[model samples]
Target chain A: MELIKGQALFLELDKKDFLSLKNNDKNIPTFAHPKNQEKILAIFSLPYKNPPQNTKLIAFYKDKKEEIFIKTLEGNYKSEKLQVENKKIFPPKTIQERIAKELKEANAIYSSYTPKALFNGAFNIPLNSFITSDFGKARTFNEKVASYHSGTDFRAATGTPIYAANSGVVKIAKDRYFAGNSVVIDHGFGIYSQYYHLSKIDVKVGQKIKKGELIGLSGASGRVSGPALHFGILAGGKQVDPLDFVSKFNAIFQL
Target chain B: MELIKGQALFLELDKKDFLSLKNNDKNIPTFAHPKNQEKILAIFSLPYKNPPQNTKLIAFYKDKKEEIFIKTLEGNYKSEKLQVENKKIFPPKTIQERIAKELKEANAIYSSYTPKALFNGAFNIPLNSFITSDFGKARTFNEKVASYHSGTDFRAATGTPIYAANSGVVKIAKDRYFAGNSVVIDHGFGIYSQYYHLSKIDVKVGQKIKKGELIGLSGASGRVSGPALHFGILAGGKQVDPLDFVSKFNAIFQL
Candidate 1:
């Protein structure tokens, strides 16, 4: 199937015969589908920028190399200009160091993987509410700063309940510089989900969570001006559209 | 002043002696600020794409020529990929015709100017709630379609009250294909404000609107999955960030 840059691809392979999979020699994580023991699921994500025209997935099964072909399409992103407080755009040197530290920690969590799958079936929206901000909007602050909206924002008030997108183990549960009271969950096979700007966090790190379990309450913490849930997904160790990832992941069940 | 592409610049000019203003020969609309009869307000907008290095505003005061300068910065838009129903990506020919017709009418209204100023002081957010979607996000649908989120989305449930951002007269108060039960207000001086996806409309065309006037009730209308109030601003006949416009226009009062 043809997919745009930054989109995720899912594949189901014979569980018993699969040894490992790689794309350009980079190891790709895989796990058995919870309901189907004979099948293993793997996700391949394209880069948000400058993706190759043709993507190849190499699966090694008992020393044999099986190749999978996927087409990459161009990405079309829109531009946004905004005026915010100067501090939010360019914080003091002390705060800059804090932001750098927070980024490094967040990256470490995103890169870590669990070998086993903890989720079953498709993922759900953190809240079955209206979407406020869509994922991947490029923004410029005061014509001097640059950033992207890395998550889907759901319209919620302070104290609105937030649920687990799927069954997983909590990987992070704490306050962060930008995320505020944030929670990150590991769904295994390099797939992760994040909820940010929470007013209250209910789960702790290392706690196993059930699908649809209440994980936190929404709020206007972090750098936001008001209350909303910033829901995010990292599949194949890169951020993708949480909604798109859910749809593609759920399609595996029908197949 | 320095601004990015798609940003609006507000200027308070001397009203009595001002004859006309233009940028590259295009007429710039102006109206007297309500609070100060001797001072007029004018907004100059830069193109969203491929803007020149420098922008010049030439004002003709009877026989005198005055110039103002604005610097244009590059827009750093981010990429987003989405999977949506085929219909949304590629509607039928009949629907395409409707969309084109709607665009023509919208452009006509944007080009129309009300010489008198109706707003006092500064603009306000239509709803005192959290923002979900920011303006000017480029979006790619189904890996083929292209568009931008042209307005800011505020979290509002169905039946939630929506108020006028500033005093003006109604230009459009009806349902449309993309904006359900939309209300477009001509806030004078070539500036307009729009509220989209409303479940109810309380004002009629040609009716005077008060600042913070109750205009409609929010809902999921048009091309939306849930309820929200898509607020938009057109200054100098171009769409810009509603929030940024509010901030920049409000700064004029401080001067």
Candidate 2:
């Protein structure tokens, strides 16, 4: 089937089938769940670029290969050049060691997986306000430093209450270098949700949380200039658009 | 004077004086206006990067010399990496000449200047809805092509009326390659405002306009997937944050 880049694809098989998906010979994490008595639903994310090799799925129901062709439609996002000022902001690190340690821990959490889908239904936005920024925007600083917008920024004020997008167990809840007072929740099936720049964290690590439960209060604690909730979603270690993920994942419930 | 990358600087001198601002020995476009009976107010945009040579201003009154220091504040924008899909969209140009011609015309407008300020009072945001995207974002596609989000996007649906940010004369109003049905307004003194992705244009080139006057209706006319109003500000031929420019230009009114 043909899919757009940065999209997720779903498949179904026998409940007892052993499933594995691969792209460019690398194994992609597939979240599986029983849809009913005999059918199993599975989902896997597609990268934006077509891999050097095509993609396929293996359903080892008594060990059988079910190769599926994964074609992609051209995304409509355009390239633009803007003559804008890039200022040198924030001096180089004094606490490089601390930052390194924090990143190591976060990486571990991102790589880990949960056994089942923790979410009960469609994911909710952390806040109801309009989105301030979209994901994957490239930002070059002074033509020297460069980076992308890793998460979606929501319009939130300091002290605004933040809620969990889905049911999950808190995997991380602490302060970090760039993402201040952050929280990461494991929603099972290789899916995780993140909230950054919180003024107050009400949940703790390893604590269970339900959809719409209060997680914290948004603030400007991180590297941000003002109060905002940077919401993110990780599907099998890939950072996809939180809004798009929510919309697509919710469609599965409708099936 | 203290400034930040993406910020503009203002100066005042006698109306009869020959005023000039320079960086790296190159002249920057400065907008001059009469603040009172004798004082002339001038504004110039500063680049994000500090030139190898320092910035200075000169008012050749009786061939006298005047130099000013331009110090900058560290901007707080940070770097981020995200795992997202980059889909190749829009094939290579079939009409490269058409695109080149349009770009050349736009560049000429950006480089040209009017002697006086056409705007009255502070600049207003083109729309009141929440900003969907911000300026200066770096977007990398398939880890190959890269670009910046040069304009601030406001949430608007198809047929939504778009108003002028300030009083000015229309410099460009036509359909183009990337920005569909684009409109550019010359606000005099090296200042211009742009409106892109219009469903309908209400004004024509060379027509005078006032602040808050309707110029077009927003739509997904360009390469975008949905309707939005991409508003941009060009000061002294440099693209700055439209929202930031609005806030800073309004401060001049207080002075």
Candidate 3:
């Protein structure tokens, strides 16, 4: 079903037919069908939540290729088009109701709008250790369906300070089952930044954070094969490379 | 061991010795035996934690009427004499662990201080419900072993606006066990204001909350026989009646 930007759409699915949905890189928040185990409903925000006009929202319940069901809806969140290849995802892949709550929380905050942007000035990198894993990397556990990685990973030990990429209101600051102590910043204009695997959250939700202010100390909050900082960005309703987002903070303001 | 105002005391109690203690109005924050059970050590912040020169701590551990081990220690929390009946408890009655985690969280946040006085104006009640359950009312479930009620209950319902009591940095804004959703403001100089049983949190930790800012919505988050907003204050580390605190907020600022 087509959706107006800033609105929500809900649907229930039958078993074995897990639906695949996306609007840019952020995962759509879905919940279990309260009464039935075989059914799960998905609810997501439109372009306002999606942020971009293109890739508005496409949902698919794979059923043997040709028999597959796919639906792509449009919305009216207006902004200049993004390069489409930006590094904006910070969450691990998920298309299952097997998906936990923190993931839903991550999406809820991502899609929710804050009309007035609160940030000023430029963004700052939490550290100079540099990026390790790049955003939009495609992966497969072992020859199943391949999915893309959201966000960038920076090499760091546990307890390193995680800084705000830009000045804005802290949309969320809490420990999740998946990301550990995670933080998401809403820097207005549907621009949001995320940090994950935090050991200590230095800031609280609804707090204003400066571009360079410390928000947390990073650690292996989630099960990590190794350790690093997961920094992701969602701007103009689409996932973009965090490095690019930080660099262009002033540039976006210039818009 | 005797304690001075603004200091914490640690103790180890012998086994088979279950202890019962309470203040003039509130049950002091404590934990029962864990693990070996024989070894129970407690670290408590004394009213001297308030830096007031007159408040003394009294404990009653009555395992038996004759076995009652009563002790009252004096501390030098300076000031003119207090009514001893003055209400100022901000903690919920938490003798059971089922008590929401927020109560413990409240105590933790209240015990912690910035030691800097930051309020510059008169304090405001989070709302006008005024006081429901006044602070310091003695309580007992079995009609014996009396304890004091901590904090004041303000008549409220879920989603009622709960405002910040005064200006300060948000110290705790999260869901807790006993208090449900709670917010604790650190107004500096070991002064704090607490709001509990909230349905929503509007500020983040360390965020600036002005004198009349909205902090959350009142609700019954934890299991309670009844419901309302829990408003409280800690001046110099001891819970004081929130109404009294606000009335004196201007007085202290004038200091």
Candidate 4:
């Protein structure tokens, strides 16, 4: 029951479980509770889909390696979308090819990591809208399921000013076919944050922006439910829990 | 004789020629000597090749628009060569197509003038390279022919810092086939400046840049001779003299 079939998994072990644990790997991030010395915490990540059983997670403790089995299970996400219809244009085959190329390009930009982080200290969430504090998944496209949405929905008003998560260079501030006016900030060291469905872009591409500076205005620029913002995080080109970073980044990237 | 056979004509009118002139077109630029009150000067521009005859340079003074016939003559420039070679790549056919597409797309950006000039002050030349004080034609390629040469070539050593010609948004900061690393800045009011053959790019695609800001380094990136920069300007998507913009964006700029 150590491994869950999920993209991001955080596991906390009790005193008994910690005592029985024999594997310890330094590379895989693991730490004890800040307050309590007994509890141990570890963070693990998988892929977009549930991992197959052939692969296993290995944790080494005292030169002893232990195999952790991944338990297969369905995603625990609610049907967050209504089967609504609109004039939103889905990409044709030709445009899809371009998207495929751009998607491949995303890795090179998102995973951009230099020797150091662009800014010192931790990241500030662009905005924590009082409307919704939840990040949903399992959105519908045609009739079947598409993918678990990593975008955390924020209740935003039209013209609501959006700020940068941290000091970094503006990588992208263009309107996408899907994400309206999207702005991607390269925060140095492959840690990038994205703001989507912006109404008015105030910053320039490649311009060095400081932390908490105004980047754009928020609005329902794309095919969305209402006036809201989609905030996403990327580390080393992989999507991670953004909210999780808010709490752990300082400790995870402790100076 | 008024009209020149090839593109770019410089006319220095004496006291008598100034008095005899009839056309008084408000749009074309005309200047006068500072110390010598009677001496007058005017610059005329054409296209890439020699213009056909029967063309008249019209200058309207008061109610009269006199026809100024350009007198064709040989250019007084030393022959430039294509001897400098190696350590660069000539763009293949595939890259040629991309360049064609980019050339077409250049207009959409260069022609983007919505009323006012974004800058309020004078513009500084990106570089005052001491190598050559004069910008001239007579640049010959494979067959040793004469063509309109831009101020594209600047004599420089490697690692020379290239600055922005003026305050503007970075429209393009990418590598190209012909130009190794290219940076194009839109100075607003339908005016754009370009820098090419860069070693390293310091700005982003959507970033706002200030005048004299370091945009890139000098290098022999594309197929070229020694380390030199190729620069150009586009007004309303049409190619123009780059030095004209550096000196007088206000005079010839009168609408």
Q: Which one is best on DockQ?
A: 3
Query: Which residue pairs show collisions in model 1?
Result: A77-B138, A78-B138, A132-B132, A132-B133, A133-B132, A138-B78
Off-target runs (Cα >4 Å) in candidate 4 are A1-44, A52-75, A80-101, A131-133, A140-145, B1-255
Each model's C-alpha lDDT? 0.78, 0.71, 0.58, 0.61
DockQ of each: 0.01, 0.01, 0.02, 0.01
Clashes of 4: 21
lDDT of each residue in A36-116, candidate 3, tens digit only: 766544444332222344335444444422121223343222233222343465555552342455555565555454333
> Candidate 1: where is the Cα deviation over 4 Å?
A15-17, A33-38, A75-77, A81-90, A140-146, A253-255, B1-255
* Single-chain TM-score of chain A, each candidate: 0.85, 0.82, 0.58, 0.67
In TM-score terms, which candidate is top?
A: 1
Name the runs in model 2 displaced over 4 angstroms. Answer: A16-19, A24-34, A47-54, A72-74, A78-94, A140-146, B1-255
Alpha-carbon RMSD, each predicted model? 22.2, 22.0, 19.6, 21.2
What TM-score would chain B of candidate 1 score versus the native chain B? 0.84
Consecutive 10-residue window with the lowest summed lDDT within model 2 chain A: A74-83
What lDDT, from 0 to 1, does candidate 3 have?
A: 0.58
* Every candidate's chain B TM-score: 0.84, 0.81, 0.57, 0.63
Best by lDDT: 1
